[PDB]
Amino acid sequence: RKQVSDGVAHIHASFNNTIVTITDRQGNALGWATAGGSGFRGSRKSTPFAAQVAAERCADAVKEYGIKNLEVMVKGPGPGRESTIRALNAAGFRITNITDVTPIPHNGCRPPKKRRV
Amino acid sequence: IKVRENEPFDVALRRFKRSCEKAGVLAEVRRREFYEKPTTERKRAKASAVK
Amino acid sequence: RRRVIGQRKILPDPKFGSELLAKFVNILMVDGKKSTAESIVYSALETLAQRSGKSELEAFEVALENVRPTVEVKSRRVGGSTYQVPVEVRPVRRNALAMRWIVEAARKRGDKSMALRLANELSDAAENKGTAVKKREDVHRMAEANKAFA
RNA sequence: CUUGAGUCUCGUAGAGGGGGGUAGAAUUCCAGGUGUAGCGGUGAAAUGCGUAGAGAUCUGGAGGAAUACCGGUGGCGAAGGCGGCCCCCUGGACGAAGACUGACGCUCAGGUGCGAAAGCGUGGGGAGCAAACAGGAUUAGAUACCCUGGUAGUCCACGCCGUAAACGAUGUCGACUUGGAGGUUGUGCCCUUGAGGCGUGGCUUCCGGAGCUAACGCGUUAAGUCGACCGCCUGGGGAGUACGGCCGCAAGGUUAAAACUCAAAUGAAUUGACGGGGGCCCGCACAAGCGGUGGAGCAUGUGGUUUAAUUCGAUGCAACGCGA
Ligand SMILES: [Mg+2]
Ligand SMILES: [Mg+2]
Ligand SMILES: [Mg+2]
Ligand SMILES: [Mg+2]
Ligand SMILES: [Mg+2]
Ligand SMILES: [Mg+2]
Ligand SMILES: [Mg+2]
Ligand SMILES: [Mg+2]
Ligand SMILES: [Mg+2]
């Protein structure tokens, strides 16, 4: 029940998917939902006009609690890393600031040669 | 990448850090590195850059 | 593919003088037989004076109320396959759209006639039975409920 | 003897090489709070991971590889090379006044040495990519292309091999020969007041003059104009393969034929066509709409079919109610 008021959020946005996990100032989780975790799948999802109906899903599981204000992490680029933040503030939310927490090597490991389509 | 302000007015200014990284140093890392292609990308896609 | 004329003006109802309805009484007439239209629709509008008895003139525009779609599925080809980008429609087609399928579904019913196979689906259509509005919502369920690509 | 080679001096920039430190980011795997039905992924999907709690997410540890940004069209070295930072031991290259010896000189078959990657050794470590391998899907099909995993092996010394489109497919050393916008270094002088300003040496990038060039192009960094030396080349396939020597743990490397055999194999350059290459239009092309065919009878043309013959020609858009 605690009623936080100063907890955080984490928007992990891969290309073919994007999750919204609401956690607390420290780091402990709180509530969540996500793209494929809502009706549309395949690649019908990913588009921003899907990954904020998710956003407004976390709202109904993060209001059982008390959040008078929050901040956000955008670990991950892609199709739902702005639009996600849009149906945020509006659906009845404050916000100190935004902080980016996306990967950044100093050239440390090799990456997937992968897609050689 | 630090924002935050006073006077609640969901401003903007998240773009100020849009041009010191972002997908920028992600395209470089995304799939693979370059290896020899930089042997011909900074020293070859440079013919792109002479005027 | 490069001509922006406009729309071709059409002749009014033989009494009321209705251009907005002038184009309804055009998509009903088979093989240019405006001798079986000016007496099957201009008359199946006064037989709604039995489905209620009220003012049948504006007792048109409302049967086309729950029957006018406003966002549509306008395809495209970018990415690797298709694109649905549903988008809005303008009035130069709105009024007309419904008019059509409205008579269209009103054909493949099976009533006693067609002065009746039409005096029926222009009240029912106003009441949400028939394919009238079920089409409407057979569409909007896909359109504007698909603004992920739009 | 002194301008060529150089020695001292005295400056100077730099990822030059070897050894020893290291700090930060970053994945992954470990350990627990949270937290719930989800994450991962493709064109979509599947394989795999998640109610034995994925992923998200936090706080912690282990550990291996690599050093974003700076970074440059840059810098270095004799090539193959080489990128944070620190410390010791150590090359080379450049310049300025000078100071010095006095043709030492530039060429070199064989000779010796360095050797990207890959691989074989002994032994180490093994975080991430990943041949080989197994699922998964696509197809006719898939021993491949994308998906999920993963062994070697990328990494370490110690040693071998000693080949690559080993690149600029363009030896070396030396003086010439119109310039024009630069990059980086070094030293002279200009109210040095100055961003800068002007001469001048190494390196360098792009245009490009004559001229050379079979064309494309090289052009002060020459593919110009000459001078010393060494390397190789003589038509294609057969063939850098076979045969002998050599080296090599081997895999193989290199020294290198013959026999048949074809009128050609080539280089650049134009001409069009064709691109599942781009850029820009045009048509009922398409999209938007109205009608109809296939399907049902019947008329009819055709190829089948059978005929004693079913009279010849038309055979995609161009033939089929076509010449009948
Ligand atoms: Mg050099
Ligand atoms: Mg190796
Ligand atoms: Mg694979
Ligand atoms: Mg030139
Ligand atoms: Mg040749
Ligand atoms: Mg026409
Ligand atoms: Mg059409
Ligand atoms: Mg039709
Ligand atoms: Mg013939």
Ligand kinds:
magnesium ion
What would the principal axes of the Cα set say about the shape of chain B? elongated
Helix-strand pattern of chain C: EEHH
- Fraction of residues in helix of chain C: 10-25%
**What CATH architecture label of chain C applies?**
Orthogonal Bundle
Derived from helix and strand composition plus strand pairing, the structural class of chain B reads little secondary structure
Strand order of the largest sheet of chain C: 1-2
Secondary-structure element pattern of chain B, one letter each:
H
Number of helical segments with 4 or more residues of chain B: 1
Give the DSSP E fraction of chain C (strand runs of 2 or more residues). Answer: under 5%
CATH superfamily caption of chain C: Ribosomal protein S7/S5
Q: CATH class of chain C, anyone?
A: Mainly Alpha
Domains counted in the coordinates of chain C: how many?
1
Query: Quick one: biggest sheet of chain B?
Result: none
Report the biggest beta sheet of chain C as strand number plus sense, adding barrel if it closes: 2 strands, antiparallel
GO cellular component, one term (chain B): ribosome
Protein name (chain B): Small ribosomal subunit protein bS21
Organism (chain B): Escherichia coli O6:H1 (strain CFT073 / ATCC 700928 / UPEC)
Keywords (chain B): Ribonucleoprotein, Ribosomal protein
Describe, in short, the structure shown:
Chain A: Keywords: Ribonucleoprotein, Ribosomal protein, RNA-binding, rRNA-binding. Chain A has 117 residues and is mostly beta strands.
Structure description:
This is part of a larger assembly, with chains A (117 residues), B (51 residues) and C (150 residues). Chain A has 117 residues and is mainly beta. Chain A is 9% helix and 20% strand. Chain A has two helices and five strands. Chain A has helices spanning 55-58, 83-89; strands at residues 9-14, 17-23, 29-34, 72-73, 98-99. In chain A, the strands form two sheets. In chain A, strands 1-2-3 form a three-stranded antiparallel β-sheet. In chain A, strands 4-5 form a two-stranded parallel sheet. The longest helix of chain A is centred in the last third of the chain and has 7 residues, at 83-89. Chain A is globular, with a radius of gyration of 15 Å. Chain B has one domain (1-51). Helices cover 8% and strands 0% of the residues of chain B. Chain B is built from one helix and no strands. Chain B starts with 23 loop residues before the first helix and ends in a 24-residue tail after the last helix. Chain C is mainly alpha-helical and 150 residues long. Chain C has a single domain (19-142), classed as Ribosomal Protein S7. Chain C has a two-stranded antiparallel ribbon with strand order 1-2. Chain C is globular and about 55 Å long. Chain C starts with 70 loop residues before the first strand and ends in a 10-residue tail after the last helix. At the A-B interface, strand 5 of A face loops of B. Bound molecules: magnesium ion (MG) (9 copies). Chain A binds one RNA strand of 324 nucleotides through strand 1, strand 2 and strand 3.
